[PDB]
Design a protein around this nucleic acid. Structure first.
Lengths: 89, 100, 97, 111, 121, 197, 79
RNA sequence: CGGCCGGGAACUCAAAGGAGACUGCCAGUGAUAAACUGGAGGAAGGUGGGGAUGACGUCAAGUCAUCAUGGCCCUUACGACCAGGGCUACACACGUGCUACAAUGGCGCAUACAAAGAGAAGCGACCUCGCGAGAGCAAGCGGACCUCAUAAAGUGCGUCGUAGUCCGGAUUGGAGUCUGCAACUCGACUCCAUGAAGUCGGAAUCGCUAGUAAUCGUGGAUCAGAAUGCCACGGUGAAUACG
RNA sequence: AGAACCUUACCUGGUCUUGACAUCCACGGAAGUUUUCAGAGAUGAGAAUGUGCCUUCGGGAACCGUGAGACAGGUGCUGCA
């Protein structure tokens, strides 16, 4: 019912954030299910290094933004308190 | 990449945000084609009285801190050299060595 | 090196690989199937499966001899068209017998 | 008639031989006249050819197309536009590159 | 389960005595080209208990030989979870599975993966 | 001749990024313009305040700027709060090892070369004061017009062990540009602390 | 012009054609917006085009009633 | 008879934390050493594969034209503005690709198979109109669901048959469609017609040893629109490495 | 990693020069808005309206115009600084 999405950059950072979220949700109750890690979006683009004649010189840049989400079967007052201690109703 | 060129860019985007809504309604009344050919002629009349600027066709969206007309991306808003220097010194999240 | 045990004949697998220009395998299998159909007219003495007189050709390790022979046969085959999937085997039969 | 006399060809393939009717125009003519597409001109009877003659004369014919093209290009060259100037001088009109290409338009690569 | 050049394959053991259905379709209807059936039959003919036991297989991704190798790895992992003596017998013959020969990453400054562009003097 | 940036290649390895905030494309661009403008403003207003590291963090519609430096009793968020439409806070982190900070040793090198101290003596004093503190590897380099003459030279001194092909190396690298009467002098400083990751 | 809308002719060129009909005697009709096409009120007119550096006059009649203004006065030259 | 819903967390997938191969073992060779060969186990056996990773210095190599800067110069100016044009011009030569010189070929009909990426001042379901580029309507989606999105070579039937022929597509004409104030120099695409050169390439020269080259297709950055370029991915898939 | 107009750094004719862009002084006016004419546009002259937040109320603060001195601007030259 209530889908709470969250995003981060580092794998350990998103793991710690989702662990804090799931610990608060286990403290609250309402039979919270486990985390749902979604595949991240890779934003790659090639960039010429120098402003003059060089075509081999191109660095490769990687963007790995972790996007996970948790699910709540029913919103209650304790869940609202744990929220106000991305959202989708 | 000059002071004059970035002044041209800021005055162009200012004129675009000024005369955007009237040009948007003009493009809309040009787009709807069911009747009123005389109103279409008056629409292109108002469009020709409107200057050639103030349009996304005129918006070039060059760099901001350098104003480089080449090597631009619509995600960082800077030049290639400047985004490479930013990822070099490390003041932007991500942008590691892509190796797959 | 995966052979083709549908007909066996690792030599025929090498023939498929050498007629498999631009990597097209199913078309080459249709090619060698029409080749088998055209060879079944006479069929020799298991000539549709193996080649005996095609080994001692006019333009000569035995594996390298067989490879050069099949290169010459494929070259003289693809040198002409005119319903190639019959005329190439006709040139092969003329060079063999 | 005297033009377009091939041997052992289909109807739509044969109808391409006329200066002004090709593949899709032949398909449209055969669909409008109810003529079979995969049949040959040798097995085709004259009763359908006598209708195909006026069906193809309804559209442009070889000589009419040639004289229309000649009249259009002579009109353009006497009006003297950019297209007419490039047609008189042997240069393309659709904005091609004449630096290294446009050799078919310019002629043989003799000098 | 197994994979081959980005082709997911799932197998399910079921005795049907000649029941080979893939993606709710027969093998002759889904696959073909008179080569995929033969290269799947190559393990099925030597030591696979070709009768009295069949496999319901599903695929997701891959082309033709990629999916053929994927379902071959699937049925050999089904044989491995079935027993280990047949796994040893298959490995004694030329049936070492899990061949990693995927496609190489496109390089920079080249026209393809391992093709340098042409340059003059 | 052309190597890679140690910090730029070891962003996720040892030394993390100086910015932590996620946004969409237009928001990322506006945020990048904002953080670059406030960093340039802070540097040009407190270049004599021994500023070393600027880290920005934006969890959710709130700016947090931490300045990792030495001698914190110089300044005391008004400028960033006036230039930004988002509430901002500042923090000052007084870090130890003042002779090992790359920005600080680069500022000292630039001040000495502007005060016309000898280049060999300056690099020797820098590497001596950085090795006496208890470090492991220090590589300094001064490029461009060594002495203000018409011939430019790149004079570099190395000591201890400064590895660059080891990815687990705790190496910090910094550039500095001094504007002098002979033009501009570029100083590249490398400092190797330890081997842990 | 996607060949379905009304033809594009600029307002200042239109009002100069109006002034030419009034008293402008059709001679000094200088045109800088050569991007505009021709609509049938301009028949038998002496139109100068600023195709290159200055204005060159051409005579446009009813045979060239539908064309582009830059066709008549080119900007390319050969030795 | 749609995973469509109950049902299940078995399986794929997803992102995490670990593990799995480290000369680990046997025999032989080798100055027991280092090291090498063969073999078992093993998914991977001798840094498995690939990317990234660029030494002191060389070319006083390129950039004061993205930028920063010592100096020199303009400062009613080489500074700011405006419209048109050029950057796309054409006696000619060179470079990198694409299309082909067809029969493993072209075309007509039915039909099998993805990875990866993108999307809201946008993608666009679905219907209707149109032979068409596309137009009116418009739910869903800043997103594993919605959209791009019908992949093709292949398979099955048929058509010709070794000719510039039904290959190929340059040029040109008539008429439209799209973005854009605006498509003439100076966009792309489509309906029809015309269909040229080209029939396998000289001296010479380039890339390639693997599911690589070769062949075919898709996506994206840039961008109002405008790439045979570039950056990534997928389908089929060789021969040779005696030296 | 993209020339229609911008790009454009170039050429033809019209313009403005403490300037298109950052800052100082003294004075007038909040800012802003609709719209007409000459004109290829840059540009000049009008016709109405709005008149705030604070009031030391000879004025604060962004903003528009007038005059001058600093300066500014330069994709102009020197990578052989």
């Amino acid at each position: 019912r209530i889908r709470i999405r969250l995003k981060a950059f580092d794998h350990r950072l998103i793991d710690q954030a989702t662990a804090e979220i799931v610990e608060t949700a286990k403290r609250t109750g309402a039979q919270v299910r486990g985390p749902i890690p979604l595949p991240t979006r890779k934003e790659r683009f090639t960039v010429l290094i120098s402003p003059h004649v060089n075509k081999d010189a191109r660095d490769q840049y990687e963007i790995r933004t972790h996007l996970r989400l948790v699910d709540i079967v029913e919103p209650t007052e304790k869940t609202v308190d744990a929220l106000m201690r991305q959202i989708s109703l | 990449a000059k002071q004059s060129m970035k002044a041209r860019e800021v005055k162009r985007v200012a004129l675009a945000d000024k005369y955007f809504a009237k040009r948007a309604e003009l493009k809309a009344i040009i787009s709807d084609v069911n009747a009123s050919d005389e109103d279409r002629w008056n629409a292109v009349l108002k469009l020709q009285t409107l200057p050639r600027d103030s349009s996304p066709s005129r918006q070039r969206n060059r760099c901001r801190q350098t104003g480089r007309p080449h090597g631009f991306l619509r995600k960082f808003g800077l030049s290639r050299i400047k985004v490479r220097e930013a990822a070099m010194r490390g003041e932007i999240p991500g942008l590691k060595k892509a190796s797959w | 090196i995966l052979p083709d045990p549908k007909f066996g004949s690792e030599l025929l697998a090498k023939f498929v690989n050498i007629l498999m220009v631009d990597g097209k395998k199913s078309t080459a299998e249709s090619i060698v199937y029409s080749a088998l159909e055209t060879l079944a007219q006479r069929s020799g003495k298991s000539e549709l499966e193996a080649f005996e007189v095609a080994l001692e050709n006019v333009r000569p390790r035995p594996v390298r001899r067989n490879a050069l022979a099949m290169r010459w046969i494929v070259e003289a085959a693809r040198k002409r068209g005119d319903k190639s999937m019959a005329l190439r085997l006709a040139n092969e039969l003329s060079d063999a017998a | 008639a005297g033009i377009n006399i091939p041997d052992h060809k289909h109807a739509v393939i044969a109808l391409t031989s006329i200066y002004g009717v090709g593949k899709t125009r032949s398909k449209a003519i055969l669909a409008a006249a109810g003529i079979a597409e995969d049949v040959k001109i040798s097995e085709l009877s004259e009763g359908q050819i006598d209708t195909l003659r006026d069906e193809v004369a309804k559209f442009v014919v070889e000589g009419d197309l040639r004289r229309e093209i000649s009249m259009s290009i002579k009109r353009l060259m006497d009006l003297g536009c950019y297209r007419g100037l490039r047609h008189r001088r042997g240069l393309p009109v659709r904005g091609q590159r004449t630096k290294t290409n446009a050799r078919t338009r310019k002629g043989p690569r003799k000098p | 389960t197994g994979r081959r050049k980005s082709s997911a394959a799932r197998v399910f053991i079921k005795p049907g005595n000649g029941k080979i259905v893939i993606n709710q379709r027969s093998l002759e209807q889904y696959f073909g080209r008179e080569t995929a059936r033969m290269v799947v039959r190559q393990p099925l003919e030597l030591v696979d208990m070709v009768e009295k036991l069949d496999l319901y297989i599903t695929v997701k991704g891959g082309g033709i030989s990629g999916q053929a190798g994927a379902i071959r790895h699937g049925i050999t992992r089904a044989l491995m979870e079935y027993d280990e003596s047949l796994r040893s017998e298959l490995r004694k013959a030329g049936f070492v599975t899990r061949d990693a020969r995927q496609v190489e990453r496109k390089k920079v400054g080249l026209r393809k993966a391992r093709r340098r562009p042409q340059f003059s003097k | 001749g052309q190597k890679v940036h140690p910090n730029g290649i070891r962003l996720g390895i040892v030394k993390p990024w100086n910015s932590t905030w996620f946004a969409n494309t237009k928001e990322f661009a506006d945020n990048l313009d904002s953080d670059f403008k406030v960093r340039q403003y802070l540097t040009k207003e407190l270049a004599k305040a021994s500023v070393s590291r600027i880290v920005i963090e934006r969890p959710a519609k709130s700016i947090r700027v931490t300045i990792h430096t030495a001698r914190p009793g110089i300044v005391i968020r008004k400028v960033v709060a006036d230039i930004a439409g988002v509430p901002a806070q500042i923090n000052i982190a007084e870090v130890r090892k003042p002779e090992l900070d790359a920005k600080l040793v680069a500022d000292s090198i630039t001040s000495q070369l502007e005060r016309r101290v000898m280049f060999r003596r300056a690099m020797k004093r820098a590497v001596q004061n950085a090795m006496r503190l208890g470090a492991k590897g220090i590589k300094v380099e001064v490029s461009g017009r060594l002495g203000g003459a018409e011939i430019a030279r790149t004079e570099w001194y190395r000591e201890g062990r400064v590895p660059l092909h080891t990815l687990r190396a705790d190496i910090d690298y910094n550039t500095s540009e001094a504007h002098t009467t002979y033009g501009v002098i570029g100083v590249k400083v490398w400092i190797f602390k330890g081997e842990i990751l | 012009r996607s060949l379905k809308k009304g033809p594009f002719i600029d307002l200042h060129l239109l009002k100069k054609v109006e002034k030419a009909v009034e008293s402008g005697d059709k001679k000094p009709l200088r045109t800088w917006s050569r991007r505009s096409t021709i609509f049938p009120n301009m028949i038998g007119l002496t139109i100068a085009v600023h195709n290159g550096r200055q204005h060159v006059p051409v005579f446009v009649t009813d045979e060239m009633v539908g064309h582009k203004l830059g066709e008549f006065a080119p900007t390319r030259t050969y030795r």
